[PDB]
Structure 1
């Protein structure tokens, strides 16, 4: 199929693009490079074993979006593009709403204009809000996210829903991601955050590489087995694979298809730390700190539905997630080249 991957050059997108090419689809990446570098492109093609076309641009530019859609005869769109720093989202709300809410709205408006009606959206478990009922299940009604980032994701899911309702021929998958980690097995592709990493894994990796002193464990008094926060980590390659499958099986299948993308199990902060210590061959330095604002104690996905409907489930383990990350971190301490 002919797919446009917005945010194609970022973390999740790049991995997805490799898997898509491996499956022989024709890929067009659209990215504005605010959070990624052109250096990843050649890696994508190498690992993907096929050439992906790249277009530097912004989802907010409807006219360009429209043109791309048409120019490449796109069949489906996978939308990874947007801003995701939760804390920053609190400090800079307008930029989040603009890039996420208006950003998607301009893209789907361009789609309408070029008659493209297959969409895949990067959503998040955050949309469940403060749900005491775990694991989280697609049948649960949504809640209210605490940050501009999470609210922006729920607002988009709502706008897509309403759109499909008005244009019933559209197929729209709302993929609710859990906690993506890991990197391509080659160790030549991976997450390359700039500045202080906000997520656990990369932070741990940076401590291990010798860049950082100690990992600050945000809270040790939660109501969990070890008292640290519990989450559903999902290898980025499993996530990528899920995106190919969803795109191939749902194309032209009208409705809004919601699926949680997670391993279906929780791991605590310590469990992750221990996994990394083992991967890197040395104890990862850490200390206990106060709870992080807005953090929920524990949550993981109920991923039965994707198993059932798309015959998709993860296959990588936590150790693998840790090992693959250390391999990428260690092989490319400076990340992607300028």
Structure 2
């Protein structure tokens, strides 16, 4: 199929592009480079084994999106583009609503204009809000996300749902992500955050590579087995594969298809730390710090629906997640070149 991958040069999108190309799809990447570099492009092509077309541009530019869509006879769109720093979202709400809410709105309006009706959206477990029932199941009513970031995702899910009701020929997949970690097994493609990493894995990795002193573990008094927060970690390669399957199986199948994409099990902060120390060959330095504002103690996905309906399930392990991350971090300590 002809697929437009917005945010295609970023973390999850890069890996997704590789798997898409491996599957022989024609890929057009759209990215504004606010959080990624052109240097990942040749890596995508090499690992994907096929050239993906790249367009530098912004999802907010409806006219350009329309042009791209038509120009490339796109059949389906995978939408990864947006902002995702939770804390920053609290500080700069407008930029989040603009990039995420308006950004998606501009893109789907362009789709309408171009007659494209298959969409895959990068959603989030934040949409469940403060749900005491774990694991989280797609059948659960959404809650109230605590940050502007979380809210922006839930708002987009609602807008897409309304759009589908109004244009019932559309196929829209709402893929709810949990905690994506890992890197392509080659060690040549991975997460390349700028500045202080907000997520656990990359932070640990930077401590391990020697850039940082100690990992601050946010809270050690939660009602979990070891007192640290528990999450559902998923290897970016499994996530990428889930996207290829969803795209292939849902294209032209009218409806709003919601799926949690996660491993279906929880791991604590210590479990992750331990796996990484094991991977890197040295004990990762860490200390206990106060709980992080707005954090939930524990949650993980219920991934039965994706297994059942798409025949998709994770295959990589937590150790692999840590190992692949360390491999990338260590092979490319400065990330992608400028």
**How high is the TM-score relative to the length of structure 2?**
1.00
| Matched residue count | 338
- 1:70 positional shift: 0.0
- 1:302 positional shift: 0.2
- 1:61 positional shift: 0.1
Q: Which residue of 2 aligns with 1:86?
A: 86
CA deviation map 1:29-64 (0-9, x unaligned):
000000000000000000000000000000000000
CA deviation map 1:283-306 (0-9, x unaligned):
000000000001000000000000
Distance (Å, rounded) in 1 between the aligned partners of 2:15 and 2:82: 16
CA deviation map 1:96-135 (0-9, x unaligned):
0000000000000000000000000000001000000000
- 1:66 positional shift: 0.1
Distance (Å, rounded) in 2 between the aligned partners of 1:135 and 1:12: 23
User: Any unmatched runs of 5+ in structure 2?
Assistant: none
- 1:324 positional shift: 0.1
User: Any unmatched runs of 5+ in structure 1?
Assistant: none
- 1:247 positional shift: 0.0
Distance (Å, rounded) in 1 between the aligned partners of 2:327 and 2:129: 34
CA deviation map 1:123-177 (0-9, x unaligned):
0001000000000000000000000000000000000000000000000000000
Distance (Å, rounded) in 1 between the aligned partners of 2:126 and 2:268: 18
Distance (Å, rounded) in 1 between the aligned partners of 2:172 and 2:258: 8
- 1:257 positional shift: 0.1
Q: Give the 3-state SS of the residue equivalent to 1:216 in structure 2.
A: strand
Distance (Å, rounded) in 1 between the aligned partners of 2:5 and 2:23: 15
CA deviation map 1:199-230 (0-9, x unaligned):
00000000000000000000000000000000
Q: Give the 3-state SS of the residue equivalent to 1:279 in structure 2.
A: helix
CA deviation map 1:168-194 (0-9, x unaligned):
000000000010000000000000000
Distance (Å, rounded) in 1 between the aligned partners of 2:294 and 2:94: 19
Task: Point out 4+ residue stretches in structure 1 off by more than 4 angstroms.
Answer: none
Q: Which residue of 2 aligns with 1:277?
A: 277
Q: Which residue of 2 aligns with 1:326?
A: 326
CA-atom RMSD in angstroms: 0.1
Q: Give the 3-state SS of the residue equivalent to 2:248 in structure 1.
A: helix
- 1:65 positional shift: 0.1
Distance (Å, rounded) in 1 between the aligned partners of 2:183 and 2:126: 23
Distance (Å, rounded) in 1 between the aligned partners of 2:134 and 2:304: 13
Distance (Å, rounded) in 1 between the aligned partners of 2:54 and 2:64: 13
Distance (Å, rounded) in 2 between the aligned partners of 1:38 and 1:224: 42
CA deviation map 1:69-106 (0-9, x unaligned):
00000000000000000000000000000000000000
Q: Give the 3-state SS of the residue equivalent to 1:54 in structure 2.
A: strand
Q: Give the 3-state SS of the residue equivalent to 1:210 in structure 2.
A: coil
- 1:23 positional shift: 0.0
